Amino acid sequence: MAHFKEYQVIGRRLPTESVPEPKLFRMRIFASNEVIAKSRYWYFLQKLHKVKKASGEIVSINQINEAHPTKVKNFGVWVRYDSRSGTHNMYKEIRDVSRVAAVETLYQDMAARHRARFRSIHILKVAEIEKTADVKRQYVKQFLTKDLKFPLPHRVQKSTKTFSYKRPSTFY
C-alpha cells in the first residue's frame, strides 16, 4: 500500500450526557500515511464494537518508531486473510531489522504466494521471536546457524554501454 509506518491510534465513542468520558480503545495500525491509518482504525473498530466514525472521535495518532532499528530480529507474524474460495488464518516468520520492514515484505509475500491484495489481509499480531528454537520455520531457521558464511556465485556486472569489448565474467 506503500512503504509503511506504524501508528498508535486512539479513539472513543462521542461523549454523551449520561456517558461523559467513554472507554477509549487503541490499535497499532500498519499504514503509509496517517490518513489511511485513521481510516483503518475505524475499519477495525466497527468490526469490533458498536461505533462508526460518525458516532465516534479520534483522540490521538502517534507514529511508533523502531526500538533498535539497527538490530536483526526474528519476527513471528500472524494473519487472517481471504483466498478466492474462503478465508484463512496463517502464521509466517519474517527476519528483518524493523517491524516496518517486516510488515512491508509480509504484504509482498501475500501478494506473491497467495495473490492476496492489501484489502484482503488482516495483520493479527506481529511480535519478536525472542529465544531461538521458538523459530519454527526452516527458511528463517536456516539463517541462525553459527559462523554462517556463503558465496554469491555467478555474478552479473550490469553494463553501462550498449557494447562491450571484453566478454564478461561472473567470478566473485
Partner: protein, 60 residues
C-alpha cells in the same frame, strides 16, 4: 486572507468575492497511477486532509 483562514464573521461575502481559483495541473503529477479512486485507496479524490497543501501548491 485573514478573513478566509480564520473563517470570519463575514466569510460568506469575503470568500464569494474571490473568483474560483484556476490552477494548472500538478507539476510532479498526482503521485498515483490512477486518479479516480479515493485518496485512501491510492487515488486522488476525497478529503486528503493536510495533504491538500502539497497538491494545491504543485498546481499553483
Amino acid at each position: 486572507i485573514h478573513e478566509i483562514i480564520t473563517v470570519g464573521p463575514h466569510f460568506k461575502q469575503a470568500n464569494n468575492f474571490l473568483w474560483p481559483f484556476k490552477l494548472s495541473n500538478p507539476s510532479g503529477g498526482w503521485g498515483v497511477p490512477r486518479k479516480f479512486k479515493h485518496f485512501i485507496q491510492g487515488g486522488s479524490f476525497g478529503n486528503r486532509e493536510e495533504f491538500i497543501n502539497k497538491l494545491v501548491k504543485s498546481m499553483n
